Design an enzyme around this catalytic site. Structure first.
Site, PDB file in Angstrom:
ATOM      1  N   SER A 244       0.819  -1.206   0.000  1.00  0.00           N
ATOM      2  CA  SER A 244       0.000   0.000   0.000  1.00  0.00           C
ATOM      3  C   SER A 244       0.857   1.262   0.000  1.00  0.00           C
ATOM      4  CB  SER A 244      -0.947  -0.018   1.200  1.00  0.00           C
ATOM      5  OG  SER A 244      -1.865  -1.096   1.067  1.00  0.00           O
ATOM      6  N   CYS A 349      -4.841 -11.917  -4.054  1.00  0.00           N
ATOM      7  CA  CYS A 349      -4.799 -11.037  -2.881  1.00  0.00           C
ATOM      8  C   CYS A 349      -6.074 -11.018  -2.040  1.00  0.00           C
ATOM      9  CB  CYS A 349      -4.439  -9.612  -3.320  1.00  0.00           C
ATOM     10  SG  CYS A 349      -4.084  -8.488  -1.939  1.00  0.00           S
TER      11      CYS A 349
HETATM   12  C1  HEM Z   1      -1.736  -2.355  -3.446  1.00  0.00           C
HETATM   13  C2  HEM Z   1      -1.569  -3.289  -2.467  1.00  0.00           C
HETATM   14  C3  HEM Z   1      -1.509  -4.689  -2.673  1.00  0.00           C
HETATM   15  C4  HEM Z   1      -1.039  -5.399  -3.759  1.00  0.00           C
HETATM   16  C5  HEM Z   1      -0.529  -4.837  -5.084  1.00  0.00           C
HETATM   17  C6  HEM Z   1      -1.048  -6.803  -3.398  1.00  0.00           C
HETATM   18  C7  HEM Z   1      -0.631  -7.850  -4.236  1.00  0.00           C
HETATM   19  C8  HEM Z   1      -0.722  -9.215  -3.935  1.00  0.00           C
HETATM   20  C9  HEM Z   1      -0.379 -10.285  -4.854  1.00  0.00           C
HETATM   21  C10 HEM Z   1       0.300 -10.110  -6.203  1.00  0.00           C
HETATM   22  C11 HEM Z   1      -0.670 -11.453  -4.218  1.00  0.00           C
HETATM   23  C12 HEM Z   1      -0.495 -12.880  -4.732  1.00  0.00           C
HETATM   24  C13 HEM Z   1       0.900 -13.408  -4.419  1.00  0.00           C
HETATM   25  C14 HEM Z   1       1.170 -14.765  -5.050  1.00  0.00           C
HETATM   26  O1  HEM Z   1       0.504 -15.098  -6.055  1.00  0.00           O
HETATM   27  O2  HEM Z   1       2.059 -15.486  -4.550  1.00  0.00           O
HETATM   28  C15 HEM Z   1      -1.179 -11.097  -2.909  1.00  0.00           C
HETATM   29  C16 HEM Z   1      -1.547 -12.040  -1.948  1.00  0.00           C
HETATM   30  C17 HEM Z   1      -1.997 -11.722  -0.655  1.00  0.00           C
HETATM   31  N1  HEM Z   1      -2.140 -10.415  -0.165  1.00  0.00           N
HETATM   32 FE1  HEM Z   1      -1.901  -8.701  -1.169  1.00  0.00          FE
HETATM   33  N2  HEM Z   1      -1.559  -6.979  -2.113  1.00  0.00           N
HETATM   34  C18 HEM Z   1      -1.802  -5.684  -1.659  1.00  0.00           C
HETATM   35  C19 HEM Z   1      -2.307  -5.389  -0.380  1.00  0.00           C
HETATM   36  C20 HEM Z   1      -2.606  -6.323   0.623  1.00  0.00           C
HETATM   37  C21 HEM Z   1      -3.002  -5.987   1.967  1.00  0.00           C
HETATM   38  C22 HEM Z   1      -3.343  -4.561   2.422  1.00  0.00           C
HETATM   39  C23 HEM Z   1      -3.057  -7.146   2.707  1.00  0.00           C
HETATM   40  C24 HEM Z   1      -3.313  -7.368   4.073  1.00  0.00           C
HETATM   41  C25 HEM Z   1      -3.698  -6.441   5.003  1.00  0.00           C
HETATM   42  C26 HEM Z   1      -2.725  -8.198   1.759  1.00  0.00           C
HETATM   43  C27 HEM Z   1      -2.723  -9.558   2.081  1.00  0.00           C
HETATM   44  C28 HEM Z   1      -2.452 -10.598   1.180  1.00  0.00           C
HETATM   45  C29 HEM Z   1      -2.490 -12.005   1.534  1.00  0.00           C
HETATM   46  C30 HEM Z   1      -2.699 -12.599   2.928  1.00  0.00           C
HETATM   47  C31 HEM Z   1      -2.199 -12.698   0.398  1.00  0.00           C
HETATM   48  C32 HEM Z   1      -1.974 -14.218   0.312  1.00  0.00           C
HETATM   49  C33 HEM Z   1      -3.199 -14.887  -0.273  1.00  0.00           C
HETATM   50  C34 HEM Z   1      -2.996 -16.365  -0.514  1.00  0.00           C
HETATM   51  O3  HEM Z   1      -1.831 -16.790  -0.669  1.00  0.00           O
HETATM   52  O4  HEM Z   1      -4.003 -17.100  -0.569  1.00  0.00           O
HETATM   53  N3  HEM Z   1      -2.453  -7.693   0.484  1.00  0.00           N
HETATM   54  N4  HEM Z   1      -1.214  -9.729  -2.743  1.00  0.00           N
END
Ligand code: HEM
Ligand SMILES: CC[C@H]1OC(=O)[C@H](C)[C@@H](O)[C@H](C)[C@@H](O)[C@@H](C)C[C@@H](C)C(=O)[C@H](C)[C@@H](O)[C@H]1C
Length: 402
Positions: A244, A349
Site C-alpha cells: 500500500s 490477494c
Molecule cells: C496495493 C496493495 C496490494 C497489492 C498490489 C497486493 C498484491 C498481492 C499479490 C500479487 C498477491 C499474490 C501473491 C502470489 O501469487 O504469490 C497477494 C496475496 C496476498 N495479499 Fe496482497 N496486495 C496488496 C495489499 C494487501 C493488503 C493490504 C493485505 C493485508 C492487510 C494483503 C494480504 C495478502 C495475503 C494474505 C495474500 C496471500 C493470499 C494467498 O496466498 O491465498 N495484500 N497480494
C-alpha cells in the site's frame, strides 16, 4: 547470454528490458542471487503459470537431493524462514485451503469497511501536519505512515510498538548478496516483534483482527495452530502495509507526471477507482512473484525442468501489448481487467478491498487538499527502489503549493 536480474537493466527503464525479453522468449532462463531461474514475462504465460499448481508456493517442502531456495529468503536462517513461510502465500492445497478459509472468516469486507472512517481520519491528520506550502517528502510524511498506522490498528499493535519495524521491513525489501547477513538479522527482529505481539494479544484480547484469528475455527478446517497464527500475523503486518505504501507513492508520482490523467480524475470522482487499478497495472508493486516447479511443467511451449525456481513477472505481464494495447501509456480510462497486480488463481490477494480503499482515500485526500501539488524534482530524477520483490518509491519530494 542469460540476463542477470541484479544488473541495472532491471532497475533502469526496466520495462523496456522486459519488452525485449518478452519479444524473444516470454519464458526464459535467467540468473539471480547466484542461482539459475526462469523468468516469465508474457501475459498468457504468466497467467498460466500462476494457475498451474504444479508450480508450488511452499518453500518449506523438501525434495530428495534438492536444496530449495527462494530468492526472497536470501540471508534468512531456516527457523526464520519458517516463521515467514507458514501462511497462505507460502502454502499449497490442502493446507492453503484451510488457512485461507479460516482467515477469510475474519478478514472481511465488513471489517475493512468498518475501518474506512479511521483511514479517513488518519489521512486527514497526516495531511494537517505537512503545512500549506514548501517542499516535503510525501513518502515519509504520508505514503508510509498511513498504511503502517492502519495495519497496526487492524492487528492490535499499540502505538508504543510502531516506530521501529518499518526500518526492518525496509531492509527486507531489497535483495543484496552483500547485505545478506543484515537482511537475515532484520528478519529475526521482525520475528521477535511478532512473537511479543502475539503474546500480548493472547493475554489481552481485543476486537482487532489478530484477536479474532486467535479464536477462529470451524468443524472442518479446524483452527490456526500456534505456528500458523504467528506466521500469518507476520505476513499480514508486512504485506499489509508495504504494498500500500508503494501504491500511494507510485500513484502520487504518476498523477504528478500525467497532468491530463489527474485532471480527468478530479473532474469525475467515479473515475478514481479505475485510476487506482491503472496505477497498479502500470507499475505493479509485486513486480515478480516466485514459484517452485515440483514437477516438470510446460509453459508457453517451454519445458520448465522439475525443481526449477520460477519468477513470474506480474509487472511484465501487465505491459504485454497482446493483453494491454499501448502498454506504456498510463491511461486511467483504459480497461484494466485482467492485470496481475493482485495475483491470479488460488493465491489472489486477500487484502484487495483494503488496498483499493487505502489508495482511493489517500490519493483523493492528498490531491484534494493540495490543488497545486507538483513534483519537487524532475521526473527523471526520482529514485526507484531496487527491488524485484516490491517496487516502490522511498523518498519523493513534492511542492505543496506548486
Ligand atoms: C496495493 C496493495 C496490494 C497489492 C498490489 C497486493 C498484491 C498481492 C499479490 C500479487 C498477491 C499474490 C501473491 C502470489 O501469487 O504469490 C497477494 C496475496 C496476498 N495479499 Fe496482497 N496486495 C496488496 C495489499 C494487501 C493488503 C493490504 C493485505 C493485508 C492487510 C494483503 C494480504 C495478502 C495475503 C494474505 C495474500 C496471500 C493470499 C494467498 O496466498 O491465498 N495484500 N497480494
Ligand atoms: C520477504 C518475502 C515475503 O515478502 C513480503 O512479505 C513483502 C513485504 C510483501 O510486500 C509481499 C511482496 C506481498 O505484497 C505479496 C505480493 C505477497 C505476500 C502476501 C506473501 O504471502 C508472500 C509469501 C511474501 O510474504 C514473501 C514473498
Amino acid at each position: 547470454t542469460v540476463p542477470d536480474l541484479e544488473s541495472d537493466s532491471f532497475h533502469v527503464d526496466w520495462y523496456r528490458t522486459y519488452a525485449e525479453l518478452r519479444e524473444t522468449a516470454p519464458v526464459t532462463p535467467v540468473r539471480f542471487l547466484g542461482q539459475d531461474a526462469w523468468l516469465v514475462t508474457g501475459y498468457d504465460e504468466a497467467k498460466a503459470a500462476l494457475s498451474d499448481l504444479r508450480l508450488s508456493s511452499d518453500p518449506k517442502k523438501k525434495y530428495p537431493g534438492v536444496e530449495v531456495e527462494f530468492p526472497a529468503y536470501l540471508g534468512f536462517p531456516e527457523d526464520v524462514r519458517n516463521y515467514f513461510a507458514t501462511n497462505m502465500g507460502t502454502s499449497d492445497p490442502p493446507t492453503h485451503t484451510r488457512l485461507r478459509k479460516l482467515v477469510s472468516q475474519e478478514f472481511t469486507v465488513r471489517r475493512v469497511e468498518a475501518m474506512r472512517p479511521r483511514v479517513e481520519q488518519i489521512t486527514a491528520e497526516l495531511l494537517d501536519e505537512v503545512g500549506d506550502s514548501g517542499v516535503v517528502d510525501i513518502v515519509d510524511r504520508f505514503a508510509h505512515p498511513l498504511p503502517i498506522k492502519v495495519i497496526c490498528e487492524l492487528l492490535g499493535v499499540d502505538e508504543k510498538y510502531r516506530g521501529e519495524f518499518g526500518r526492518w521491513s525496509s531492509e527486507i525489501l531489497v535483495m543484496d548478496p552483500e547485505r545478506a547477513e543484515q537482511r537475515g538479522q532484520a528478519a529475526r527482529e521482525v520475528v521477535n516483534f511478532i512473537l511479543d505481539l502475539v503474546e500480548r494479544r493472547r493475554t489481552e484480547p481485543g476486537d482487532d483482527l489478530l484477536s479474532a484469528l486467535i479464536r477462529v475455527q470451524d468443524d472442518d478446517d479446524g483452527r490456526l495452530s500456534a505456528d500458523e497464527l504467528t506466521s500469518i500475523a507476520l505476513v499480514l503486518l508486512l504485506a499489509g502495509f508495504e504494498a500500500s505504501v508503494s501504491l500511494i507513492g507510485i500513484g502520487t508520482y504518476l498523477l504528478l507526471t500525467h497532468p491530463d490523467q489527474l485532471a480527468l480524475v478530479r473532474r469525475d470522482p467515479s473515475a478514481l477507482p479505475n485510476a487506482v487499478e491503472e496505477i497498479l497495472r502500470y507499475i505493479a508493486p509485486p513486480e515478480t512473484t516466485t514459484r517452485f516447479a515440483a514437477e516438470e511443467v510446460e509453459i508457453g511451449g517451454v519445458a520448465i525442468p522439475q525443481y526449477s525456481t520460477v519468477l513470474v513477472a506480474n509487472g511484465a505481464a501487465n505491459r504485454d501489448p497482446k493483453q494491454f494495447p499501448d502498454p506504456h501509456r498510463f491511461d486511467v480510462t483504459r480497461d484494466t481487467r485482467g492485470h496481475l497486480s493482485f495475483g491470479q488463481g488460488i493465491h489472489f490477494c486477500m487484502g484487495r478491498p483494503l488496498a483499493k480503499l487505502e489508495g482511493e482515500v489517500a490519493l483523493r485526500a492528498l490531491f484534494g487538499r493540495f490543488p497545486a501539488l507538483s513534483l519537487g524534482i524532475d521526473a527523471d530524477d526520482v529514485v526507484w527502489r531496487r527491488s524485484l520483490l516490491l517496487r516502490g518509491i522511498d523518498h519523493l519530494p513534492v511542492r505543496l503549493d506548486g
